[PDB]
Write a structure and sequence with these properties.
This is part of a larger assembly, with four copies of chain A and one copy of chain D (107 residues).
Chain A: H1 2-12, H2 20-27, H3 33-36, H4 46-59, H5 69-83, H6 90-108, H7 112-123, H8 129-142, H9 147-160, H10 163-175, H11 181-193, H12 209-223, H13 228-233, H14 246-269, H15 276-300, H16 305-313, H17 316-330
Chain D: E1 2-8, E2 21-30, E3 35-38, H1 39-42, E4 46-49, H2 57-64, E5 71-76, E6 97-106
The chains are: A mainly alpha (331), D mainly beta (107).
Protein name (chain A): Ryanodine receptor 2
Subcellular location (chain A): Sarcoplasmic reticulum membrane
Family (chain A): Belongs to the ryanodine receptor (TC 1.A.3.1) family. RYR2 subfamily.
């Protein structure tokens, strides 16, 4: 029994075969259309049918986003079918860019952007693996600053007047986690007592840094390329009944993560050496804060004067002061 | 070409159907794409199957078959509305499993089969049915809680698995607290077993759960027991019976493997001092008499039949003097276990010094000395020769003074010969003398 | 009107109530199926919001009060006598509209169906009333489909009332649907409801259609027509025999059918009278045929046990002698030469008679009609031809 | 309280003895003629060992009065049948039961 | 009962009556199933299953009634135990290998030595002369060999006939012809009554080329309706489950 469990953990799980691109290519193919010679309105292909199923499930009214292994697996497959990824030639880089554009077109020509927006809206601000997969798929289809995907997303949001999408975004920001000295110290006490960590890293400290980075990277990719439309819509949604200031939500989360980073600084200031676990926690928190700073920079570059004024009147300066203290001492 | 394989055949068939027609049935679309993903995720099938794979030797086959049959009956009874017949059937099934040897010898098999999840589902169904009103089928809740307590006690991994259900059990902690002999058959008992003597889970305990427990304790200390006053007990202003249960859960939360968990102890002390009504009428801190006075009033209540009984083992008759005694004893025991360590005191930690000072302010030394000095009732020999033995469940017991001594040693400590000799003269020596006098053949 | 105030004094907004009930039903109409998914979901959301607001303002109780106060009158004529003849015309339509409005208010809404559980008992009490039976059934069906808590309240009396509705109103499949909803709700079975419905509906075998496997029965006859009439050349006494060369008692799970005797036509048509052309009916299963099966005399689909020496069901090597006498109407039988002390008599003799044998599968029989068509094994009774 | 009529005769000598198993084919009808049970439908001979209260006592002694190889009609009144309670779901209360019973074997 | 093709009201009421029978016997109510065995007996069930002129609604209702009275309890028990693999360590268990021979070709799914523990299949004899109550455990008996033979024969006939797209499918529609038959088939396969040659003939019916043992056109190639496609999806799901179980047992044997 011990061998069975260890074998499952060490060999079966570590087995990796790559099939996502081929499967998506197979699903995007029409089947013998001139042979059935209907020559009417073109039928939606299997990939389009699958995306339509996911979109309909997201659009169905529910009190909670139901966990769906099918949606998770196929969102992961579609996300991995896009990236497909020393120095390279200009021709090689351009071919890579065109290949990525074609792979993203395979999905966003069949409703993928609308599906991810609908899933985020139906999340209703509750974090989970569904939302993580949706954000990863959105990042996969938005990598490189896809102007067509951005335009489709904005057009869908403006047409549907989806206040729920922005409310869910704000809820996800509020639910995003930060560094936890209480959990870190309890973990250190447990290690000192000597109990074996049943989880690989005791990852409870900074619960979902990958999810936080994915969320803020999706927000940055919405505005990538100095997209004035999103970098104004995220601040204020003109045609909607209610408005959520995504810029202010982002700066609030930046303030929180800065406070947590300062907490770890103050904890480790007296000690001569930083433990490996603490150093890993600093690395993850610094990565999250870096992503947040990049998201704010994407918010305000291509000068968006509304976003600039909002950040100037927000609590950005307190976070910057704390970061300056932390930098000047940890340097 | 010929598929030569079920996997290739299924992949081709699903793709061909999907491109042949626009499927109008969402269930059909879902089944098709689930099957296709299964064909392309043959590794995932093993990833899901090996954790639910368990091997046994030949000698355990019959017992495993019987256990699986009982588990199948219990699982099938999830699909029917709970009634008297279903209650009897699941009680029999849980008893059969609990009497099966494979249950004890293979805890990993039970956890893989997810028995705790099934029994928790049943308990959730029973409690949610009439959660607001009186609990229908309390005997199912008792049996399920007893099964989950045994499951926790089998192994630490079972205890860790049951620990994930702590929030629900704490929300349902007040199901059968007032009923005696329901001891060890309550969701609070299950929650206590999910943490008992497990340092990792005691440390994983977080502040909101302790706040829930402290809120329940404050409610018990502020209001009387509605069911007890409906069954005739005099309407005192508080609920020692439930207060003692919550104090016991907090004791298990703060004390683990003979050593105090300092984080939980500090948090519980802070919450208790923020809600001072958790300490009971004597230690309310506004117009209340001392702990010794509370013990003496409880003595008078216990030896007064009218104030003790409902007046229309415990059964309906919960002895209220003993209940008050046990509540105060449990509170003092919990505080003594929450007291900080002497090595921390010597090192001079401000938090430890502050907590010890808070406990000293709560409990005067004279109260502890007097309660220890309180004398016991003694088993006597009647003129016939038969032993006239008092019912200890309705009177003062040595465990109360044991808690007294625990608090006195942990918080105050004995460090001066004058105090040591005074305490020995007043409280300890009479007890040793009485125990020595109880050394006759019949009275021992 | 109940307090007996003058009909002209107090006013009933009958037309306004009818129009408002129609408008409310249209307002709570569920979305159509052919619409796009997004529009359908929006319509469903709006309908749920309307239902929630109506429930929070307590409109269901008001509709129930209106229904209760309309139910104090047993008929439209009674309401017309009390309140005016136009109100009598509108009474039944208003009751139907009120029940439809209640069903639309609570349909598909779990909270509303759960809150209707307390009044569920009051609803069932008027199932027997023909003016409200259908609406009460629809409301009950919606409540039972949506709310398990309301299903928990249904008891033996309510189930028996529903079964009595089946018993008194005929075969209505909506009642069966209601019983199915009582049996199973949201994939959870109610053992009490299942047992009650079983024990109170099945054993009677008087309401539900009953099914059974029946052996096909065929009849064979000679092309002989015997009759009696005033001033006719027909003889009146006839005799024939049947010999059972082989018979298998149980070819199938149902007993093998083998009956022998006489049958009569309707009037002077050559067709046998008053019987099914095909099916499981044989000789003696109508009032035109007269049969013997070894133990019973059969007529009018009724059997009568008749005694004979060593009486037994017709078996191998049995010779049955059938005698018909139309002078005084009589049909008599002899088994293996012994008389059978039972007779058919005083039957209709206005039609033509003929020998007949009815049988299921698994027989070999032989007609012995006398002369060159089968030698008799026994001497015919005197006078018989 | 059981009335027996012969349909097809048996040997007339061999009868069920105490501590013996009767193997039969029976078809059960309600008094109105509606069939409710039959071993021939299931194609399995019904076996019962006499004297140990396995079957309804009407069927019991009515079979006990039968010879080997015999076919008979057994009329059982409700007192020897399920009686006032009936059998839930199949037999109504106070029902007279007619059984077409053939003793195949004694073992 | 074949006239209910033209009496509509009687047809509707009797179909809902069959649905009520299924509802009252639903989810393991063995006492009610035994009671229903008196009202709808085994010869009636077999005749309704086999008859080709049966009205479609009644045919579906009687297939459902047969499954619910005699088959659903054990089918559901085996389905609950499906995704769990308790493999005793016996010599039989040590015998299993991944592939039947050196030519590493997959064996026919479901065929081969299987040693993982499964629920015990037990049935009770319906008998209203008997006064014992033990029969109220376990579902009532049914002839499973006869049911298997009839299911295989009618499935072969349906595969041959519906491939011609005949204008007179049994029950009136291709759905009425195939959905109940394939449902009863899938229930029997879930219970695992099929063994060896029966399962080989079945796999050839599903797909002759792929399941050829080491012209004919199987079910998967017949342009099926959507409910039939859903049932075939369930069937292929069970076949994949069988392959997974064989893999698990062989892994234990090697381990």
């Amino acid at each position: 029994n011990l061998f069975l469990q260890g074998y499952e953990k060490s060999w079966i799980e570590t087995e990796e075969h790559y099939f996502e691109d081929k499967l998506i290519e197979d699903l995007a193919k029409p089947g013998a259309e001139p042979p059935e010679e209907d020559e009417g309105t073109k039928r939606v292909d299997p990939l389009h049918q699958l995306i339509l199923l996911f979109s309909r499930t997201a659009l169905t009214e529910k009190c909670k986003l139901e966990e769906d292994f099918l949606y998770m697996a196929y969102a992961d497959i579609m996300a991995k079918s896009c990236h497909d990824e020393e120095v390279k030639s200009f021709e090689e880089k351009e071919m890579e860019k065109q290949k990525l554009l074609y792979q993203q077109a395979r999905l966003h020509d069949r409703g993928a952007a609308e599906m991810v927006l609908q899933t985020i809206s139906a999340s209703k601000g509750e974090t989970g693996p569904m939302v993580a997969a949706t954000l990863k798929l959105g990042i996969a289809i938005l990598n490189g600053g896809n102007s067509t995907v951005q335009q489709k997303m904005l057009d869908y949001l403006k047409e549907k007047k989806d206040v729920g999408f922005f409310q869910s975004l704000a809820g996800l920001m509020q639910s995003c986690s930060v560094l936890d000295l209480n959990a870190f110290e309890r973990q250190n006490k447990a290690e000192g007592l000597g109990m074996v960590t049943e989880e690989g890293s005791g990852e409870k400290v900074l619960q979902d840094d990958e999810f936080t980075c994915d969320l803020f990277r999706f927000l940055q990719l919405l505005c990538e390329g100095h997209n004035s439309d999103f970098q104004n819509y995220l601040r204020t949604q003109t045609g909607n009944n209610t408005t959520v200031n995504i810029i202010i939500s982002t700066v609030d989360y930046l303030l929180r993560v800065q406070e947590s980073i300062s907490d770890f600084y103050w904890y480790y200031s007296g000690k001569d050496v930083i433990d490996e676990q603490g150093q890993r926690n600093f690395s993850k928190a610094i990565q999250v804060a870096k992503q947040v700073f990049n998201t704010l920079t994407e918010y305000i570059q291509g000068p968006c004067t509304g976003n600039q004024q909002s950040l100037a009147h927000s609590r950005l300066w307190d976070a910057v002061v704390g970061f300056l203290h932390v930098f000047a001492h940890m340097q | 070409k010929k598929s030569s394989t079920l996997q290739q055949l299924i992949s081709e068939t699903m793709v061909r159907w999907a491109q042949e027609s626009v499927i109008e049935d969402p269930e059909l679309v879902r089944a098709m794409f689930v099957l296709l993903h299964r064909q392309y995720d043959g590794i995932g099938g093993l990833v899901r199957a090996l954790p639910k794979t368990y091997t046994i030797n030949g000698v355990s086959v019959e017992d495993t078959i019987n256990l699986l049959a009982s588990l199948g009956q219990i699982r099938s009874l999830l699909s029917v509305r709970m009634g008297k017949e279903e209650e009897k059937l699941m009680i029999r099934g849980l008893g059969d499993i609990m009497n099966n040897k494979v249950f004890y010898q293979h805890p990993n098999l039970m956890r893989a089969l997810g028995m705790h999840e099934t029994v928790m589902e049943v308990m959730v169904n029973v409690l949610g049915g009439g959660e607001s009103k009186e609990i229908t089928f309390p005997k199912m809740v008792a049996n399920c809680c007893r099964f989950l307590c045994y499951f926790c006690r089998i192994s630490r991994q079972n205890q860790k698995a049951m620990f994930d259900h702590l929030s629900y059990l704490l929300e349902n902690s007040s199901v059968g607290l007032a009923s005696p002999a329901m001891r060890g058959s309550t969701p609070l008992d299950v929650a206590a077993a999910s943490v008992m003597d497990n340092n990792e889970l005691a440390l994983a305990l977080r502040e909101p759960d302790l706040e829930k427990v402290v809120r329940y304790l404050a409610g018990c200390g502020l209001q009387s027991c509605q069911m007890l006053v409906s069954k005739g007990y005099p309407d005192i202003g508080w609920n020692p019976v439930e207060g003692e249960r919550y104090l016991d859960f907090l004791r298990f939360a703060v004390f683990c493997n003979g050593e105090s968990v300092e984080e939980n102890a500090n948090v519980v002390v802070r919450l208790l001092i923020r809600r001072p009504e958790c300490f009971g009428p004597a230690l309310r801190g506004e117009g209340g008499n001392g702990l010794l006075a509370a013990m003496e009033e409880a003595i008078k209540i216990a030896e007064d039949p009218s104030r003790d009984g409902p007046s229309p083992e415990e059964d309906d008759t919960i002895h209220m003097g003993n209940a008050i005694m046990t509540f105060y004893s449990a509170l003092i025991d919990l505080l003594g276990r929450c007291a900080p360590e002497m090595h921390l005191i010597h090192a001079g930690k401000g938090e430890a010094i502050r907590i010890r000072s808070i406990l000293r302010s709560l409990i005067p030394l004279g109260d502890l000395v007097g309660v220890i000095s309180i004398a016991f009732q003694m088993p006597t020999i009647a003129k016939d020769g038969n032993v006239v033995e008092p019912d200890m469940s309705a009177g003062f017991c040595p465990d109360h003074k044991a808690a007294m001594v625990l608090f006195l040693d942990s918080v105050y400590g004995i460090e001066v010969q004058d105090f040591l000799l005074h305490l020995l003269e007043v409280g300890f020596l009479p007890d040793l003398r009485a125990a020595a006098s109880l050394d006759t053949a019949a009275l021992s | 009107l109940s307090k007996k105030a003058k009909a002209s004094t107090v006013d009933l907004p009958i037309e306004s109530v009818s129009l408002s009930l129609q408008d409310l039903i249209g307002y709570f109409h569920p979305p159509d199926e052919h619409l796009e998914h997004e529009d359908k979901q929006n319509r469903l959301r709006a309908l749920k919001n309307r239902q929630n607001l109506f429930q929070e303002e307590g409109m269901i109780n008001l509709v129930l009060e209106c229904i209760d106060r309309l139910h104090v009158y047993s008929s439209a004529a009674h309401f017309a006598d009390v309140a005016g003849r136009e109100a009598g015309e509108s009474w039944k339509s208003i009751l139907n509209s009120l029940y439809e409005l209640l069903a639309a208010l609570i349909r598909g809404n779990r909270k509303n169906c759960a809150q209707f559980s307390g009044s569920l008992d009051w609803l069932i009490s008027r199932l027997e009333r023909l003016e409200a039976s259908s609406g009460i059934l629809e409301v009950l069906h919606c409540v039972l489909v949506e709310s398990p808590e309301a299903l928990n309240i249904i008891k033996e009396g309510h189930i028996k009332s529903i079964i009595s509705l089946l018993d008194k109103h005929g075969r209505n499949h909506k009642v069966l649907d209601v019983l199915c909803s009582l049996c199973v709700c949201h994939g959870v079975a109610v053992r009490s409801n299942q047992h009650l419905i079983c024990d109170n509906l099945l054993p009677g075998r008087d309401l539900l259609l009953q099914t059974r496997l029946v052996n096909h029965v065929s009849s064979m006859r000679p092309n002989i027509f015997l009759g009696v009439s005033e001033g006719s050349a027909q003889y009146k006494k006839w005799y024939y025999e049947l010999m059972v060369d082989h018979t298998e008692p149980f070819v199938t799970a149902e007993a093998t059918h083998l009956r022998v005797g006489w049958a009569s036509t309707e009037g002077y048509s050559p067709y046998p009278g008053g019987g099914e052309e095909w099916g499981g009916n044989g000789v003696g299963d109508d009032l035109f045929s007269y049969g013997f099966d070894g133990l019973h005399l059969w007529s009018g689909c009724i059997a009568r046990t008749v005694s004979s020496p060593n009486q037994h069901l017709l078996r191998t090597d049995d010779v049955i002698s059938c005698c018909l006498d139309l002078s005084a109407p009589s049909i008599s039988f002899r088994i293996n030469g012994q008389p059978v002390q039972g007779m058919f008599e005083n039957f209709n003799i206005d039609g033509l008679f003929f020998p007949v044998v009815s049988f299921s599968a698994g027989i070999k029989v032989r007609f012995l009609l006398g002369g060159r068509h089968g030698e008799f094994k026994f001497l015919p009774p005197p006078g018989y031809a | 309280g059981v009335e027996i009529e012969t349909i097809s005769p048996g040997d007339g000598r061999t009868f069920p003895k105490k501590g013996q198993t009767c193997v039969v084919h029976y078809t059960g009808m309600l008094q109105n003629g509606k069939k409710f049970d039959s071993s021939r439908d299931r194609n399995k001979p019904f076996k019962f060992r006499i004297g140990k209260q396995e079957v309804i006592k009407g069927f019991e002694e009515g079979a006990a009065q039968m010879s080997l190889g015999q076919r008979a009609k057994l009329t059982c009144t409700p007192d020897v049948a399920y009686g006032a309670t009936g059998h839930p779901g199949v037999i109504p209360p106070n029902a007279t039961l007619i059984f077409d019973v053939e003793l195949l074997n004694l073992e | 009962i074949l006239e209910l093709t033209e009496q509509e009201e009687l047809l509707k009421f009797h179909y809902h009556t069959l649905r009520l029978y299924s509802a009252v016997c639903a989810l393991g109510n063995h006492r009610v199933a035994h009671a229903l065995c008196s009202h709808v007996d085994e010869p009636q069930l077999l005749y309704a299953i086999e008859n080709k002129y049966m009205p479609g609604l009644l045919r579906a209702g009687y297939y459902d009634l047969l499954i619910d009275i005699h088959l659903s309890s054990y089918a559901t028990a085996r389905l609950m135990m499906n995704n769990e693999y308790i493999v005793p360590m016996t010599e039989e268990t040590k015998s299993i290998t991944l592939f039947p021979d050196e030519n590493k070709k997959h064996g026919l799914p479901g065929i081969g030595l299987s040693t993982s523990l499964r629920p015990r299949m037990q049935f009770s004899s319906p008998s209203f002369v008997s006064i014992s109550n033990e029969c109220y455990q376990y579902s009532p008996e049914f002839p499973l060999d006869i049911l298997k033979s009839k299911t295989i024969q009618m499935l072969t006939e349906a595969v041959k006939e519906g491939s011609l797209h005949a204008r007179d499918p049994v029950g009136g529609t291709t759905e009425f012809l195939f959905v109940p038959l394939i449902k009863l088939f899938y229930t029997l396969l879930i219970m695992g009554i099929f063994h060896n040659e029966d399962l080989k003939h079945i796999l050839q019916l599903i797909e002759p080329s792929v399941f050829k043992e080491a012209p004919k056109e199987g079910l998967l190639q017949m342009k099926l309706p959507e409910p039939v496609k859903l049932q075939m999806c369930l069937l292929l799901q069970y076949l994949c489950d069988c392959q997974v179980r064989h893999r698990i047992e062989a892994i234990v044997a090697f381990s």
